[PDB]
Structure formats: structure tokens, C-alpha cells
Amino acid sequence: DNPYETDELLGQYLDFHYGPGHFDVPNYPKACIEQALAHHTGTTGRALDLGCAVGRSSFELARRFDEVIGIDLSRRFIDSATRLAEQGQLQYQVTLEGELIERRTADLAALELSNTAGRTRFQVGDACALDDTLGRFDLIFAGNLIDRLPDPAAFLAQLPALVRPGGLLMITSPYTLLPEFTPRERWIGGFERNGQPVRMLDGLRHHLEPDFVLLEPTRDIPFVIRETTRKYQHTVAEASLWRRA
Template sequence: MMSSSIFPRDPQVSVSPHCYSRYHSDAAAAQYCDAHYGPDKFGVPNFPAQLARLCTDAAATDRRGRALDLGCAVGRASFELAKHFEQVRGIDYSARFIDLARRLRERGTLTYQVFEEGELVADRRVCLADLDLAAGAARVGFEQGDALQLDAQTDGYDLVLAANLLDRLSDPGAFLAGVHRLVAEGGLLAIASPYNWMEEFTPRKNWLGGFFRYGAAVTSAEQLHKRLAGHFVPVGSPRDLELVIRENARKYQHYVSELTLWRRVDPQR
């Protein structure tokens, strides 16, 4: 964990680390490796690769120095960003995911197993060179960490990507209140989320949306705009991106995340 957090969290809010244990399991490792590096499923394009492309397209050509990939999982978006950015830092809460991403960066290849049915598995192999990701791998660094415990030195990024992270934080409001400190003026913030609020990750009182307040529906999208308005302006329109996670040969999870892009501005101007 990093010290001297820049995010103003409520000290009374806590979520048991037990809820994150799923991201350390063999099943999760297989599912995320396959989601990041395996074949496309049902015609749905690769989710992290799409994210990286859209972020790069929105970033000014003279603002492609440093990128931060928060909730990087096993690293596909980080490697994709390194094709265009000079330095990429990937951070994830799961030490298991980070270990896999590091091994892939260091060796250039990674073998993992996917479940077929029951106890039956099949070997899969990923090669960075085959995905045109090898050239930039040296510009990527991976580390285990908590997105709500980044220190004050973690700032000045030209791009901060938070993909499917927001609804897995114990205090997403604190994250949004402090995220401007990570982004350089004129830099880009990219947030993708299915807004799948669950109390095992986020206490209900900290949900951004998905509930009624005084009889009116509160949505996560409108809360994003309200909470980021002081330091960011939206770039373009929200966009839906699909993600398919393979559990076994005949069972898949299908998510739709809303991607919003934001340009960091100086509130004094």
C-alpha cells in the first residue's frame, strides 16, 4: 500500500478485503487473461484494446507522455497504451493479476488455462509480439496497489484510465473528488463503468447512483458530471463498450460499460 493518500476518504467506511478474494483465484486469472488476450467472443471486439484506442485518439498528440492505468487487471490496456505513450504505469489491487502482467512483460509470452467443463481445462498461450505489443513493453511498469491509496507524488499524468473500477471502490465519491490531482492540466481522464453497484464492494450509502432520493431517480452518469464539473469538461459523448468474460466453454458474462472522457481544466480560468 502507498501512504499519504490524496483521496479524502471517510475513515469510518471500510469494506472487507474478503470481497476481493475472487480476483486472486485461478478462475479469475484464467477469465481475465482470456478476456484481455484471448480471441474475440460473439463478435465483440477486445474491451481493453478498444479503450486504449479511444483514449489515444482523444489525447492530443503533444500530450502522450505519461499514462496511468488504474485497475489494469492483467495489463492489456497498459500494453496497448505503450504503443503511443512514452511511459505507462499499471496498478491493480490484485497481486495475482499484477504478477501475470509482469511475467508477460518480462518474458513476452504467457501460458494460462481456460476451463472447458467441470475440471477439464485447455491451455492457451499469449505472445506480445503476435499482438504487436512487444515493442512498447519496456515502457510499461506494473505494481500492486489500492486506487484509493495513491500518494501525493502520483500526479501529472497526461492520461488516467479507470476501467471498470468505479463500482469496485469502497468510496467512489472520494476517488472522484481527488482524481483531478492525478491528471495534468489539459490531460485526459477516462472512466468506464457498468455501474454495477454491490454492497460487498461499496456500502450503499456510497453508491453514486442506482437509487431514489426524495422520490427522484439518481443515476451514476449524472453524478459523474456533478462531481467532476469543478475540474473537468466532458470530451465527446458517452459511449457504450461491451466486455465478454468466458467462464467455461458454454457460460459467459456479458457487460456493457459506459465510457466517458474528461479534459482537465484549471478552475481558476
């Protein structure tokens, strides 16, 4: 039932996280973490990467944080991230055209990520119901996650307790709201209420303030996902950075 446990998605996401770029758009997980690191003014002991997929943002965070925990619900994704952490490389297939496929390599050494791979730990888990043993963090990253969760409010309700005061929360999303992933009654934005628009960002503020303070302004970060030799997604996420009060 989970698309994120399929070979189709594995090949998209291993290319997206570790492959060459497309249309001269920079690697997206790396671009996201560059922005988080440019704004984090706290200590660098511990970061949490929620919805980490096959782990590029977690390895990027590990260049600066002593410990990085990456959590994703997809076991196929997490098994790839762990293999990269432990062996430094893996191979995968991408679609060329129809059934014609091509084998490719992901390599942490080539990306200058192998030296700190030991600072990562990857686990399967549900971001809407995180273990109560997880502790708290100096920095939390949730990339392209909130529009893929069935209970966004339940996810957000954990975050004040998960971030130390003075720490940083970074959420990015293109707000691709879909009933397949979020029941309409659980949307926190993307609709009209009492005849006025409620944007997803308004929903984020309602749930996070004043425990977090939004660093203004929000920023657009684009990304490209390769599906075949010829077909790509090209999308503009909104990044919002939040300081814990």
C-alpha cells in the same frame, strides 16, 4: 477474500485481455484505449491505468505514451502483467467443463505489443488511496473499476490533482453496483434522492465538474468474458471522457 486473487478469475481475465474474441465482439481493453487515443489532444509523456488487471490496456497505451503505470490491488494479476512485460508471454489454464481444463498462451508479440512493453511498469496499489509520490499524468484510464471500489468518492477526489490541465480522463463501467464491492451509503449513483433519479453518470459529474469537462456524448462499449466453453458474460459499459480544465 479477494475474488481477483483466485485462479478462476486469473483464467477469465487472461483470456479476456489476451485471448481470442467471442461473438465477434472486439477485445475490450484494446477498444477502450482506441477511444482514449482518438480524443487525447495533450502531450504523450505519461499515462496511468487504474485497476489495470493483467494489463492489456496498459500495453495498448504504451504504443503511444513514453511511460505507462498500471496499478491493481490484485497481486496475482500484477504478477501476470509483469511476467508478460518481462518475458513477452505466459501460459494459463481455462475451464472447459467442470474439472476439464485447457492450457493456453498469452503472447505480446502476436498482438504487436512487445516492442513497447518496456514502457510499462506494474505495481500493486489501492486506487482509493494512491501514493502521494505518483506525480501527475497526461492521461488516466480506469476501465470497469468504479463499480468495484468501496469508496468511489474518495477515488474521484484524487483525479483533479492527478491530471495535468488539458489532459484526458477516461472512465468506463457497466455500473454493476453490488454491496459486496461498494457499501450502499457510499454509492454515488443508482438511486433516488428527494424522489428523483440520480444515475451513476450524474454522480460522476457532481464529483468531477467543473475541474473536468465532460466530452459529450458518452459512448457504449460492449465486452464478453469467457467463463467456460459454453458460459460467457456479455455486457455494455458506458465510457465517459473528461478533459481537465
